Design a protein around this ligand. Sequence first.
Ligand SMILES: [K+]
Ligand SMILES: [K+]
Ligand SMILES: [K+]
Ligand SMILES: [K+]
Ligand SMILES: [K+]
Ligand SMILES: [K+]
Ligand SMILES: [K+]
Ligand SMILES: [K+]
Ligand SMILES: [K+]
Ligand SMILES: [K+]
Ligand SMILES: [K+]
Ligand SMILES: [K+]
Ligand SMILES: [K+]
Ligand SMILES: [K+]
Ligand SMILES: [K+]
Ligand SMILES: [K+]
Ligand SMILES: [K+]
Ligand SMILES: [K+]
Ligand SMILES: [K+]
Ligand SMILES: [K+]
Ligand SMILES: [K+]
Ligand SMILES: [K+]
Ligand SMILES: [K+]
Ligand SMILES: [Mg+2]
Ligand SMILES: [Mg+2]
Ligand SMILES: [Mg+2]
Ligand SMILES: [Mg+2]
Ligand SMILES: [Mg+2]
Ligand SMILES: [Mg+2]
Ligand SMILES: [Mg+2]
Ligand SMILES: [Mg+2]
Ligand SMILES: [Mg+2]
Ligand SMILES: [Mg+2]
Ligand SMILES: [Mg+2]
Ligand SMILES: [Mg+2]
Ligand SMILES: [Mg+2]
Ligand SMILES: [Mg+2]
Ligand SMILES: [Mg+2]
Ligand SMILES: [Mg+2]
Ligand SMILES: [Mg+2]
Ligand SMILES: [Mg+2]
Ligand SMILES: [Mg+2]
Ligand SMILES: [Mg+2]
Ligand SMILES: [Mg+2]
Ligand SMILES: [Mg+2]
Ligand SMILES: [Mg+2]
Ligand SMILES: [Mg+2]
Ligand SMILES: [Mg+2]
Ligand SMILES: [Mg+2]
Ligand SMILES: [Mg+2]
Ligand SMILES: [Mg+2]
Ligand SMILES: [Mg+2]
Ligand SMILES: [Mg+2]
Ligand SMILES: [Mg+2]
Ligand SMILES: [Mg+2]
Ligand SMILES: [Mg+2]
Ligand SMILES: [Mg+2]
Ligand SMILES: [Mg+2]
Ligand SMILES: [Mg+2]
Ligand SMILES: [Mg+2]
Ligand SMILES: [Mg+2]
Ligand SMILES: [Mg+2]
Ligand SMILES: [Mg+2]
Ligand SMILES: [Mg+2]
Ligand SMILES: [Mg+2]
Ligand SMILES: [Mg+2]
Ligand SMILES: [Mg+2]
Ligand SMILES: [Mg+2]
Ligand SMILES: [Mg+2]
Ligand SMILES: [Mg+2]
Ligand SMILES: [Mg+2]
Ligand SMILES: [Mg+2]
Ligand SMILES: [Mg+2]
Ligand SMILES: [Mg+2]
Ligand SMILES: [Mg+2]
Ligand SMILES: [Mg+2]
Ligand SMILES: [Mg+2]
Ligand SMILES: [Mg+2]
Ligand SMILES: [Mg+2]
Ligand SMILES: [Mg+2]
Ligand SMILES: [Mg+2]
Ligand SMILES: [Mg+2]
Ligand SMILES: [Mg+2]
Ligand SMILES: [Mg+2]
Ligand SMILES: [Mg+2]
Ligand SMILES: [Mg+2]
Ligand SMILES: [Mg+2]
Ligand SMILES: [Mg+2]
Ligand SMILES: [Mg+2]
Ligand SMILES: [Mg+2]
Lengths: 114, 118, 56, 61, 123, 209
Amino acid sequence: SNIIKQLEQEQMKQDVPSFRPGDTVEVKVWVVEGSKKRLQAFEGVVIAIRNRGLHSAFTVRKISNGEGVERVFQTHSPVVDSISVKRRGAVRKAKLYYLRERTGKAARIKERLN
Amino acid sequence: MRHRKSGRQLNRNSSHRQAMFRNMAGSLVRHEIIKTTLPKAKELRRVVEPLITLAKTDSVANRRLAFARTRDNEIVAKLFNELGPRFASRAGGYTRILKCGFRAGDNAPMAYIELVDR
Amino acid sequence: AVQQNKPTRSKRGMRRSHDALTAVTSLSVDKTSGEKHLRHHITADGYYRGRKVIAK
Amino acid sequence: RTSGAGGQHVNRTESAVRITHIPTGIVTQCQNDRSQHKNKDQAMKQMKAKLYELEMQKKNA
Amino acid sequence: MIQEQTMLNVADNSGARRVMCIKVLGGSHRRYAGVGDIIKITIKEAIPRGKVKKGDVLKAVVVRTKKGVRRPDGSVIRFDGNACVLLNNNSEQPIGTRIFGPVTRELRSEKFMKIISLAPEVL
Amino acid sequence: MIGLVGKKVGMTRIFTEDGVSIPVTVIEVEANRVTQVKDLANDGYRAIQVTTGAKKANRVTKPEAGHFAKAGVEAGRGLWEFRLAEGEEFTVGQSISVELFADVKKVDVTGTSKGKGFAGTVKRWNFRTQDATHGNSLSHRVPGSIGQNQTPGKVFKGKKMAGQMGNERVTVQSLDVVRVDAERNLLLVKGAVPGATGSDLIVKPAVKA
RNA sequence: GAUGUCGGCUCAUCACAUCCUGGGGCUGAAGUAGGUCCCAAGGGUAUGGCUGUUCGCCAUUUAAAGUGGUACGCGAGCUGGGUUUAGAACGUCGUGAGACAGUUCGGUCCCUAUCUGCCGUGGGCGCUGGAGAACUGAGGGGGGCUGCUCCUAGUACGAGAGGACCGGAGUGGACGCAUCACUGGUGUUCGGGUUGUCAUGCCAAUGGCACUGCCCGGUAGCUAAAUGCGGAAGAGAUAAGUGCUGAAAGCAUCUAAGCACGAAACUUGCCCCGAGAUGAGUUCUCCCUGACCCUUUAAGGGUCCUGAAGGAACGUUGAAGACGACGACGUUGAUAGGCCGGGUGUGUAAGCGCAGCGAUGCGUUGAGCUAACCGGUACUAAUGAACCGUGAGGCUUAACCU
RNA sequence: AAUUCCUUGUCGGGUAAGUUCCGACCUGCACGAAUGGCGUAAUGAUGGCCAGGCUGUCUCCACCCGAGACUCAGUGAAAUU
RNA sequence: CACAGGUGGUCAGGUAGAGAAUACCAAGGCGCUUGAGAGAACUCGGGUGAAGGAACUAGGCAAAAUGGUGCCGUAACUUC
RNA sequence: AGGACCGAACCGACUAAUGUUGAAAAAUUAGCGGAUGACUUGUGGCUGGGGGUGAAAGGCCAAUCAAACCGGGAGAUAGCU
Ligand SMILES: [K+]
Ligand SMILES: [K+]
Ligand SMILES: [K+]
Ligand SMILES: [K+]
Ligand SMILES: [K+]
Ligand SMILES: [K+]
Ligand SMILES: [K+]
Ligand SMILES: [K+]
Ligand SMILES: [K+]
Ligand SMILES: [K+]
Ligand SMILES: [K+]
Ligand SMILES: [K+]
Ligand SMILES: [K+]
Ligand SMILES: [K+]
Ligand SMILES: [K+]
Ligand SMILES: [K+]
Ligand SMILES: [K+]
Ligand SMILES: [K+]
Ligand SMILES: [K+]
Ligand SMILES: [K+]
Ligand SMILES: [K+]
Ligand SMILES: [K+]
Ligand SMILES: [K+]
Ligand SMILES: [Mg+2]
Ligand SMILES: [Mg+2]
Ligand SMILES: [Mg+2]
Ligand SMILES: [Mg+2]
Ligand SMILES: [Mg+2]
Ligand SMILES: [Mg+2]
Ligand SMILES: [Mg+2]
Ligand SMILES: [Mg+2]
Ligand SMILES: [Mg+2]
Ligand SMILES: [Mg+2]
Ligand SMILES: [Mg+2]
Ligand SMILES: [Mg+2]
Ligand SMILES: [Mg+2]
Ligand SMILES: [Mg+2]
Ligand SMILES: [Mg+2]
Ligand SMILES: [Mg+2]
Ligand SMILES: [Mg+2]
Ligand SMILES: [Mg+2]
Ligand SMILES: [Mg+2]
Ligand SMILES: [Mg+2]
Ligand SMILES: [Mg+2]
Ligand SMILES: [Mg+2]
Ligand SMILES: [Mg+2]
Ligand SMILES: [Mg+2]
Ligand SMILES: [Mg+2]
Ligand SMILES: [Mg+2]
Ligand SMILES: [Mg+2]
Ligand SMILES: [Mg+2]
Ligand SMILES: [Mg+2]
Ligand SMILES: [Mg+2]
Ligand SMILES: [Mg+2]
Ligand SMILES: [Mg+2]
Ligand SMILES: [Mg+2]
Ligand SMILES: [Mg+2]
Ligand SMILES: [Mg+2]
Ligand SMILES: [Mg+2]
Ligand SMILES: [Mg+2]
Ligand SMILES: [Mg+2]
Ligand SMILES: [Mg+2]
Ligand SMILES: [Mg+2]
Ligand SMILES: [Mg+2]
Ligand SMILES: [Mg+2]
Ligand SMILES: [Mg+2]
Ligand SMILES: [Mg+2]
Ligand SMILES: [Mg+2]
Ligand SMILES: [Mg+2]
Ligand SMILES: [Mg+2]
Ligand SMILES: [Mg+2]
Ligand SMILES: [Mg+2]
Ligand SMILES: [Mg+2]
Ligand SMILES: [Mg+2]
Ligand SMILES: [Mg+2]
Ligand SMILES: [Mg+2]
Ligand SMILES: [Mg+2]
Ligand SMILES: [Mg+2]
Ligand SMILES: [Mg+2]
Ligand SMILES: [Mg+2]
Ligand SMILES: [Mg+2]
Ligand SMILES: [Mg+2]
Ligand SMILES: [Mg+2]
Ligand SMILES: [Mg+2]
Ligand SMILES: [Mg+2]
Ligand SMILES: [Mg+2]
Ligand SMILES: [Mg+2]
Ligand SMILES: [Mg+2]
Ligand SMILES: [Mg+2]
Ligand SMILES: [Mg+2]
């Protein structure tokens, strides 16, 4: 209700960039190795966005070292330091789960030149 | 468990329910008062009142939407030419249900559902 | 599955102890016509809460 | 219970006998007769014979 | 979520191409193994000159799963296939010398640090 | 120790600076007013009765209204009792706020679990279903055997069978207290507490510790 | 004048002759690890290959993969591979019909629960004036498992190899309870794509039918694979066992008098039910303070007047629910629908304009639509009534006022 | 071996593990030449074994859509005793 | 039995389709002689399902899967 | 050309589920086999009980078959209940 909405608004980030399903984004996240906290970048196509307030999330799919990896980031998590849109993609669906069956030239996404 | 769920199956499949409520909505618009069962009337409210709210604003798009919801141009015309203008100021609740005894054939609880202004 | 012994008239009546019907507690009287009716239902003449609702 | 057990009796009775020599690891088994006692006798005979042949084989070698 | 009869790919240069989980080790009635868990595997396909041969029974550590791993903030990392690294049956140290594909931070332990060091990317 | 009666506002998450999402249940613990204090001399045991919230005057019966008026407190949506310890002492009319739990680390939350209705053995007692195919005849989710052949010749008491599941008092013990927001009258506890949103919860200092 | 059977499945329950975990004695017990016996039944006590198999062997685990009873538990719970009819064939026996604790291929598993029992859920009356709540706890049930790592400590022990007891912390497996914040499933009540066909006069736009026609997404709810929590600590009395003091029996002696320890077993401690606990308990609060007549004259019956507290009924309903029941609300109202705003999902509606020969693209445009969600809002429906429930509540004896 | 009791014979193949299967062996309890012997392409709702694909068959079940079951009105059995 | 059974011959529209298959329709005929609610277990008939993929079982039973036309190409063995 | 191939009508009936006081004294649903032939079907005829007919199962001969049904011998006989 108003109570939970207040408790969530006080935790929501205020700078989350606008990204649509199909865009290529780089998410820099905090990884901690023992005693040193550094930033690691995950760049790939946003194949799903779940808009749910503080519980908002987005899935990014990359092909790393010959293997497909998907990472579901909690948008307002303190571990996601930054999100940047490196390329705007032109899709028509909201969930590009069909890319999971496509590889190489078959998985290309046209740029939204607008 | 049906926790926090809406709608009545009414011992029908979904297509049958949709067709029945389309026909019954047309009948209520046409006659302005009909006698049905109490469950069916309490669902006809949720079918019909949104149509009148749609008719409140007259556009080609809204007329086509109303045709899709109620495939009959006489009902669309009445909604957009009389009923909408009539219920313009009313917020909601364009219908009322009056319980009217039990059906002789099956002891079914019966009711009259009518447009409020009628 | 079926009875091994015939149940009695006593047991029959005991089972039917909960089968009795319940009379209507009271009938409401319309403020305008004075006709009696089931509460929250229209009268036979078509009056509910003092207003004729169905013409006949 | 023995295999191909034909009838209520055979399905019910523990007639088949298997004898294992723990040191040797050799096994004999009999389920020819309807009687556990006769089956155990035949299996004991076979166990003695197999231990004999084991030592016979060693000596022949 | 690897169980018995699950076929996994191999992420090292040990020479196996396909292995099958025959037991999820470490518990009675333990059902599933996830990233960082040791399983007993049989080699179903191997390259001709590899160190390991088809039909060998050894151990392996699951390094990539389709079910994925869940990070403390609720995030999940999912891979497109189930992959393991074969380990010696006794020492439980990696048999190969190269690791192919990404591995996760869950693998980091004093035991599996060799894999972490030899990995192309630790996600 | 005494506890407080609150309401299940819902479930949320708290994001800590070290990248951990704590699942929390938000309990609105309004001021609980003491309507009666029971003692050894008069009642044989030491306890406080508390009320919380508000009620329609037209829905408060005269018998209940007399009790509230004797206390000198406004009517609440119910009355609950808490057994007092040896040192604990309160007075009628005193109000107790969520600040009581400020230094409490773990709490036990009791509520009425969501009601599942007439539930089968598979759902209620985690029975295993029989084979879906391979010849099973009308017995895919049925209980199976319920006893032995003649000895005992009866079904034992407490046999796990189908029946009502849920809508019963359930206590979850040793839940962390994530936050005590006194100004919003909120208690944020880690994990899931019994009951649906809008239900009453009895929150006590943890007994196991 | 019929007690259905091997194995499996589902569900078990008890015994202890204990497989693991607990406690101990002796050891041919240095430590680690064992052997053997005693106490202990709280919890726990594999998945596969082969075979109809039980059994068994084998592979790989586990702390362990216990032994048994229960019609070798359980077919009005399931199966039907084996066995057990009728078909057929092989080997063998017989001249033959046929036969085989020989084998081989195929071959109908009914029952709507009356009673007891059990799991749930109501109605009645009782509990001694009626009523609304909160309790107490006689009693009953649940639960009780365990691995690995680290510290102690490479310490004690040991020639080395190896390697502790006691005590502490962390993290798992299996099991159970709850919940849906997250990750997912579902989501024929939301959106979109698309095939065939029919219809809405036609175009455009829609609708119907084809498993929701086929699909792609997805709200609420429900839910696991998701994520919180639990097993305990402590106390009492003990088992085997260990003792102190101590005679009978100038010694000795754990015992005879007296005294102290001693386990997952017992009684508690934790969770739930629980006053039909007829031994029906306790506390708080609320309500009712009229007259008259008869009889067989009493815990008697009437007559009038009075109808309280509260309940029930009815209606709107609910994360409550088979029906009951339980909860919320009924105009002095947010109970349900509608409506309004938001959110969410889908993914840029239609119409119009432009580009293109055209399919189509672009602009208007993150557009349009949007269930169960959230915040509001009396527009619709929750009717004034009526109904049930009474009028101060027995006797005896105490104590106190009197 | 539709034949072999012993017997899950032994050896080889396949499997992590194979009383079944396949290839041999010959010690044929108790094969054998028109109650035919040994082969055999094609064929088979024929028996056994193996693999790929596929999957709620299963780990381990969850949700949804319909018809019953449940409540109300009407009609109204049965075995058994 | 106003019973999901059995019963020979004749007629043969449109669109798609090879078709008398199949889907939707025409002419024509019907909604099947108990209804109304609710939306528990369980049974029946379907839909979907994370990760796995025969571990199930006597046995892949059942389900899932494959599925058209044209072209390319196609093994042992063979009675060609 | 073909006791040829695929597949409706048509004829059949291999598997499962349902039903088992059934919608049905043998069916329904999803699949399954043949489908120019030793095919299938209408009408009529013929074969009769120790007889018929049987691509053979003791199969079929009016829901009856190791000897049909109806009537008679007949109140067969029953050391049995
Ligand atoms: K009728
Ligand atoms: K022990
Ligand atoms: K010992
Ligand atoms: K025990
Ligand atoms: K055996
Ligand atoms: K047992
Ligand atoms: K028996
Ligand atoms: K029985
Ligand atoms: K009885
Ligand atoms: K959820
Ligand atoms: K959901
Ligand atoms: K269409
Ligand atoms: K002494
Ligand atoms: K009482
Ligand atoms: K409302
Ligand atoms: K556009
Ligand atoms: K447009
Ligand atoms: K939108
Ligand atoms: K032979
Ligand atoms: K001959
Ligand atoms: K020949
Ligand atoms: K064959
Ligand atoms: K004859
Ligand atoms: Mg609702
Ligand atoms: Mg019905
Ligand atoms: Mg009754
Ligand atoms: Mg015999
Ligand atoms: Mg419920
Ligand atoms: Mg059956
Ligand atoms: Mg079934
Ligand atoms: Mg039985
Ligand atoms: Mg008898
Ligand atoms: Mg003992
Ligand atoms: Mg005991
Ligand atoms: Mg105990
Ligand atoms: Mg076994
Ligand atoms: Mg087998
Ligand atoms: Mg016995
Ligand atoms: Mg047994
Ligand atoms: Mg038995
Ligand atoms: Mg059989
Ligand atoms: Mg025969
Ligand atoms: Mg057959
Ligand atoms: Mg049965
Ligand atoms: Mg107990
Ligand atoms: Mg939610
Ligand atoms: Mg989802
Ligand atoms: Mg869907
Ligand atoms: Mg749609
Ligand atoms: Mg037209
Ligand atoms: Mg058109
Ligand atoms: Mg149509
Ligand atoms: Mg349809
Ligand atoms: Mg049609
Ligand atoms: Mg002495
Ligand atoms: Mg323990
Ligand atoms: Mg109830
Ligand atoms: Mg949106
Ligand atoms: Mg559209
Ligand atoms: Mg072999
Ligand atoms: Mg062979
Ligand atoms: Mg021969
Ligand atoms: Mg001859
Ligand atoms: Mg021959
Ligand atoms: Mg043939
Ligand atoms: Mg009835
Ligand atoms: Mg009829
Ligand atoms: Mg046609
Ligand atoms: Mg047709
Ligand atoms: Mg249903
Ligand atoms: Mg089903
Ligand atoms: Mg399906
Ligand atoms: Mg699946
Ligand atoms: Mg999948
Ligand atoms: Mg696969
Ligand atoms: Mg198997
Ligand atoms: Mg098995
Ligand atoms: Mg099949
Ligand atoms: Mg299919
Ligand atoms: Mg042919
Ligand atoms: Mg015909
Ligand atoms: Mg035939
Ligand atoms: Mg058929
Ligand atoms: Mg053919
Ligand atoms: Mg054909
Ligand atoms: Mg014969
Ligand atoms: Mg006949
Ligand atoms: Mg004769
Ligand atoms: Mg005579
Ligand atoms: Mg006679």
